[PDB]
Symmetry: D2
Subunit: 388 residues, 4 copies
Amino acid sequence: MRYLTAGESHGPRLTAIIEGIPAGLPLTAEDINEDLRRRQGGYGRGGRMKIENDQVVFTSGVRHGKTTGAPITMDVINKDHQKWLDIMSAEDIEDRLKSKRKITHPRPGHADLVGGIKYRFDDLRNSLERSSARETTMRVAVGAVAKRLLAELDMEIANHVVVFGGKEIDVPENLTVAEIKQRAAQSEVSIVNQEREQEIKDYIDQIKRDGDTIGGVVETVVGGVPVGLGSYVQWDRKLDARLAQAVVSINAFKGVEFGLGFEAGYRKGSQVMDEILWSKEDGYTRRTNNLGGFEGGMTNGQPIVVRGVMKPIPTLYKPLMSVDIETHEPYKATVERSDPTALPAAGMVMEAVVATVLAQEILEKFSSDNLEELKEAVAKHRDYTKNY
Amino acid sequence: MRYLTAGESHGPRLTAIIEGIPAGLPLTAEDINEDLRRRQGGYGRGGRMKIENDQVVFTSGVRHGKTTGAPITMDVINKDHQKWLDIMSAEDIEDRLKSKRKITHPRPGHADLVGGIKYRFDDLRNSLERSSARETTMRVAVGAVAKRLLAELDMEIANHVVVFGGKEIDVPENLTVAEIKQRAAQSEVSIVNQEREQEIKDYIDQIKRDGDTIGGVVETVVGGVPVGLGSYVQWDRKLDARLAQAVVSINAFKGVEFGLGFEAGYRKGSQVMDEILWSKEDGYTRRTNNLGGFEGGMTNGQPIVVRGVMKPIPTLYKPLMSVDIETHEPYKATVERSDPTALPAAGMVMEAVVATVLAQEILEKFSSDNLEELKEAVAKHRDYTKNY
Amino acid sequence: MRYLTAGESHGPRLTAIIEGIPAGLPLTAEDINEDLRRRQGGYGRGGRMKIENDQVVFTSGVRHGKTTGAPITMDVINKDHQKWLDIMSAEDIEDRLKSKRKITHPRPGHADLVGGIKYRFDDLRNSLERSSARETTMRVAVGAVAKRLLAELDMEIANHVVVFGGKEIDVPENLTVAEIKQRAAQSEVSIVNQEREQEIKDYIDQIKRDGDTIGGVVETVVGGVPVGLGSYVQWDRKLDARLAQAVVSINAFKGVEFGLGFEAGYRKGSQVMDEILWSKEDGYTRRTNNLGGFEGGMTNGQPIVVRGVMKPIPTLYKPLMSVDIETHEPYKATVERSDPTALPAAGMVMEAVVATVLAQEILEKFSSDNLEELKEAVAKHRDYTKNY
Amino acid sequence: MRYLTAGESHGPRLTAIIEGIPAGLPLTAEDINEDLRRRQGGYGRGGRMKIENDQVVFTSGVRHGKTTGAPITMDVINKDHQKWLDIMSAEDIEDRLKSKRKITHPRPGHADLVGGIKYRFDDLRNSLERSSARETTMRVAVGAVAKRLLAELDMEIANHVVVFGGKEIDVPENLTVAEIKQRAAQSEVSIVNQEREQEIKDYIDQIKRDGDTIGGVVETVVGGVPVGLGSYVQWDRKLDARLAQAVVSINAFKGVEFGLGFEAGYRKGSQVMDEILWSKEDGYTRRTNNLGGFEGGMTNGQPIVVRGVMKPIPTLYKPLMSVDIETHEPYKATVERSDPTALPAAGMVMEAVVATVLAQEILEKFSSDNLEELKEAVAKHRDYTKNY
Ligand SMILES: Cc1cc2nc3c(=O)[nH]c(=O)nc-3n(C[C@H](O)[C@H](O)[C@H](O)COP(=O)(O)O)c2cc1C
Ligand SMILES: Cc1cc2nc3c(=O)[nH]c(=O)nc-3n(C[C@H](O)[C@H](O)[C@H](O)COP(=O)(O)O)c2cc1C
Ligand SMILES: Cc1cc2nc3c(=O)[nH]c(=O)nc-3n(C[C@H](O)[C@H](O)[C@H](O)COP(=O)(O)O)c2cc1C
Ligand SMILES: Cc1cc2nc3c(=O)[nH]c(=O)nc-3n(C[C@H](O)[C@H](O)[C@H](O)COP(=O)(O)O)c2cc1C
Ligand SMILES: Cc1cc2nc3c(=O)[nH]c(=O)nc-3n(C[C@H](O)[C@H](O)[C@H](O)COP(=O)(O)O)c2cc1C
Ligand SMILES: Cc1cc2nc3c(=O)[nH]c(=O)nc-3n(C[C@H](O)[C@H](O)[C@H](O)COP(=O)(O)O)c2cc1C
Ligand SMILES: C=C(O[C@@H]1CC(C(=O)O)=C[C@@H](OP(=O)(O)O)[C@H]1O)C(=O)O
Ligand SMILES: C=C(O[C@@H]1CC(C(=O)O)=C[C@@H](OP(=O)(O)O)[C@H]1O)C(=O)O
Ligand SMILES: C=C(O[C@@H]1CC(C(=O)O)=C[C@@H](OP(=O)(O)O)[C@H]1O)C(=O)O
Ligand SMILES: C=C(O[C@@H]1CC(C(=O)O)=C[C@@H](OP(=O)(O)O)[C@H]1O)C(=O)O
């Protein structure tokens, strides 16, 4: 299974094509819209998010509620585009109008300047329009399709904020994936423990009044995973490593870690390995989950636990120093529309990207031209695993 | 450029094939051997590291001291194989001899059990032989070819330990890559500040007496990096993300971060973006390097700064709890030859892997059938960059 | 450069995304539409070709006349979809309405039955809608983008029919690419010598009235190609082999050959090899082009000459024998809407696919994040080639 | 599954690494060696083939007679290397010695000149050593591993010469794969009709005394093929097209065709489609096999029938004009002893590459981390197919 996303922030619309989903999967637009809606939200996002109402339009690969195995195409319109018809026209317009919203003041922390050097642009809007996170809308759309697959295979996934601009959220011990998703869904900041709900909001508004931005750490958990997805025989077959690329490819993300993660570099061997247990009732399991679901680049059957750090949004309403690309003189950075933080939204993109890599791995490991054989292949493999 | 590594820990030899290096790159067995030697070192490694004397043998693609563009084949013999001629024989032997060194007690933390389930093994040695970090020897070897290409393009790379089993190393501000390489080579634990050298060493010794293991955090730095390598136009073209997959693919790595890394989730935007500066003498630069060389998934010209966390080595001489796979009874894990720590060596592995990806990215971006045209494409791009 | 095509024959629309085209390439909807029009033509096409008027819509990656380097999305609407609103709805509909246009009598030669076994379909139109050649419309839209790149690099391409249902064309010797393009465009069956045009039209009418079909052989020729695209150093880098996959992947194609092709298996070495020549004026050239522009899987600078055989359309109006997948009784294949032949269109698809593969090979060989750098590299390479 | 081949014709040895073969496959050196012996054979092959005695050495991935799922490494020594130790040494040597056997006279029909332009060589030996068909030895080694997988899945493969230097071999009607395999290797020229055996040998001799070369056409046939391998959903998923690239990648191959092949462009649809039949005994079948086992890029369950044309060996005793690359002066190329033909050996290479691609497709289609699950999946899939 593979895919490509396309579209510009202020273009007419976004598009994604997914090639390789099995035939037979029940799939509706509501299956996608629920996640699209979750991605637009989170306390701290404003502006564009109150202008868009992201919903999907399928134009291929889905027939009468089920996929057919053909490429699936999903669209999401940009309502805002009616204000950028000339500026973002595909066709040429007269010289004289091109100057409009032309960007020559790169913003620190964004792709503007380097995208201009690489692609040799005279207008950095040509870097901005694609590098913008509006694109994550289609990543979530692809992840919602991936999630339908995981749901048919009795797997569960959830995401929650565990660090918000420095505030470490004390998560209760031994929550199920279902509990994580339900608690988190009740918060406007995706935290499982809310006595901090009002405290974090206040802070986002401080930061907001203060004219600054914050980021944090988001955690994705996956339950019911089959054992032996990924492989140690070659470096690029390791599933944790595959997930690492996908997480870090999310706009603003600067790191990814599994289970204890970086803490594992501060502890002893005996405090980190997860002992192996067996029962006639359940077959193999592990006493603890410090490795976050992976042994040797492979799923061991415990929950997958991965965290990603999102740096603060680069756009500051209180600029920062930059340089004017036409004069080479220092100046403040351009101020494009943005928010004090988009962390909860980033955690939804993270959930979608993890689900997507997972679904890719499942489709590669098991017979999967169609849902029936895949579901059969997975049941058989879970029976084998249980009785090993 | 692409490659495959092969070989078992106690098989006769390790092998690697590299396809796609440009013709005309000066390359010698000593260019490789220097790094193989580093990989074998580091206070805390014993056993095998005194038996093996890792050196390469070229058998294709190198002629008269230069690559030809054809596939390069490198071999590294396993001197230890002499003690395993029967056990690791490619051809069938007497059934009665097959139980030798057979493993039925998986080790927590290692690939034993899950590899056994995935591949349907009755002898967990079949997992161990290939999941062993003995394979990282060939990754270092491929890395040494990649480093020669970086050297030809005026780039420099180094690695050092910045956290050793929880002891954080105090790194002097403003060191060049060359100083980090030089100071680290004077330490038995690869730290650039030897004030904790004896303390780290005695800590290792304690760990070993205590019968436990420790990991840490290694940092790789790359200097003189061309701008605009990597792209934001699609997620899987982001170079930070490609490095992420490669770093976490290293045995025992549970995480990866760039620049400030996870600490960016604890700061404000104004304390994280790197301001943009310009001078007639140097072109564009950045005031600070909190982003570790990456904006928008692309190199910004600042030093690339990446860290990976190595969990503690799973094999404890004081074995943890497990299960006998033939009887399903609880039992202590198998105790195989291992060391209290392999962090310094992991650092070298990371250095090679980072270099590998980077050379791959350079070979994608520039005309690179031969070194001549590659060097010219790179100089020309550097000139463009400098004058943007 | 990579791309995906998507869409069903009777769904709402077709879509394609191309990822990786350099920034800076002039591109308009007319650059695409000219080839979409060619593809709908050819004496012998009717039905659908009378309902559709294929024209593109760009929704991403194109701004004010040029590419930006971001993913390019193209749509082609299916006007006919208004007749299939229920039959092809993405949303589920009442069970009884699903019998509408349901295929249970598979057509010999088409993807019907096999797709039904592979994907576990009960309705074989689910095989039909995606396997149908309506999809070639988007492969031609991608080729048109590829062809714009080839034109900025001073390359030319043309296609022509050389066999039309067994009638071989007597092709004058030593025509240029441009001559081929011009002469074939003045013919209603894309033949460059019209002595048999009326005979071929009369034959097509005959096949039609008899409820039969015909295919033939088309030839694509590419001029001005750079030397050394492709490589012999690994089998999958050979450019003639890469083209071979792309040509056979066109619907109804059953084979591909280069230069003399299969005739080379009937002649002696001395009658096939192309002698090497050199002059201060032209640099290296070849006396003849029996090899069709390739030596060792690499372009040698002569015209690329490649031929593909298109088998006859499978859907015959006097249907062949098949089986009712519901009762297992013998029954005549279903008769869907089809032409007696679509060879001239198939020629345009083949021109597009060849140009695509070649653009991809060029983008891989040369620095090509943007058009300016790509043009400078190709000029430089041509300079080195001429003066070798 | 993927693999890389490496080595020079006059280097010390050839090497291949295959990654992704399921654990559990019985495999021995003789499994490979049988094919390697066939590949050295064929009337018309002389020189080298009498010195070389190709046998494989396994150095990884094979233990006690079975694969383990890790990367497999195979070596084949070049006995001829002994006469080239200086010339082909990896390490640098005195400048005065580097001109030994330097090549500056490109052979028409070979990779020489174009390779030296591409890779900017002064010595065309660096093109020649790797472009040589000596490399096909490792492609046949790889194909032998693939063939072992096919045999475990009850599939059979064979190759025979159908056209020899223009002599069309009259093949009996409807030979099975096993018949073709048996008859063909009773022949020193791989033909299934031995009334023409002496005739072809004499013709080969005649060509040789005439100082010329011949090529021809080889047909590979595959039986017991599962249905539904390959897909129509995207062009690059079609298995006929994947086989096309593999076949045209063989040195000297200039075309590939399936079933009736190019003859399908001369016939009518009624004379080409294969009618679909069903019986309670055997399930679905076809009345004829004009399509060569493919419908919509997918296997239909009839025997795969593919033919490739091999141009004649380019090196001749008859003169062919070329140019001296150091002087730009014309010269006549002539080789006193060259083989007149390598067609029967090319047929072995064709069988191997075909077998390889099929194994790859099978590994992709079905659950295949280990042989046991693969077998189970294939069995389940044939039961579904038969009972559709
Ligand atoms: C959900 C989400 C929303 C974002 N919103 C904004 C925003 O409003 N303003 C901004 O400057 N960056 C925003 N970002 C961050 C930028 O897209 C990103 O920092 C930039 O493209 C550079 O890529 P990099 O930070 O990964 O290096 C957002 C990211 C995510 C995941
Ligand atoms: C058991 C343990 C676990 C820790 N885990 C991490 C970690 O995962 N990430 C990190 O950045 N620091 C980690 N450290 C470092 C401590 O957080 C650090 O010493 C502390 O925050 C004080 O920092 P300061 O000296 O910079 O104020 C940990 C320390 C210990 C003892
Ligand atoms: C240089 C290096 C040396 C290692 N040496 C050991 C060792 O002696 N014993 C051990 O159990 N693990 C060692 N490992 C770690 C194991 O290979 C590894 O934990 C195991 O394959 C499971 O992979 P994972 O930890 O990535 O999940 C080493 C890793 C590296 C990078
Ligand atoms: C400014 C700041 C930065 C921090 N950076 C990190 C970090 O990068 N990684 C991490 O794991 N913890 C980080 N933390 C947490 C501290 O390391 C500290 O040890 C933490 O509060 C844990 O203490 P506890 O786990 O005993 O409550 C940071 C804390 C602060 C105030
Ligand atoms: C331009 C074009 C038009 C075609 N139109 C038709 C048609 O009208 N009816 C039909 O049965 N097949 C048509 N085909 C062929 C089928 O799509 C094709 O034979 C089928 O998908 C099975 O694929 P295969 O022939 O490659 O095995 C056409 C092919 C091309 C290139
Ligand atoms: C089995 C085999 C043996 C070959 N032996 C010879 C040979 O002895 N001499 C020769 O000139 N070409 C020989 N060839 C052909 C060349 O390798 C080939 O023409 C050349 O590398 C250029 O590639 P191309 O013909 O695919 O363009 C052989 C090919 C094969 C498959
Ligand atoms: C549109 C989204 O976020 C955008 C991401 C973003 C940026 O630079 O990354 C900039 C803003 O877009 P705009 O300037 O139109 O307000 C964000 O709002 C979205 O998530 O759908
Ligand atoms: C051989 C190396 O490391 C090995 C990696 C390792 C493991 O499980 O990862 C186990 C030990 O191997 P053995 O049991 O033979 O001593 C390590 O020493 C090496 O780095 O070259
Ligand atoms: C639509 C095209 O070709 C179609 C390919 C086709 C088939 O089996 O391949 C069937 C017909 O479509 P329909 O049944 O609507 O008339 C063809 O005309 C086209 O070239 O644009
Ligand atoms: C060595 C093989 O074939 C070789 C292929 C070949 C060529 O250009 O392709 C040239 C000859 O090599 P040389 O000139 O040393 O004899 C062939 O013999 C072989 O099949 O193993």
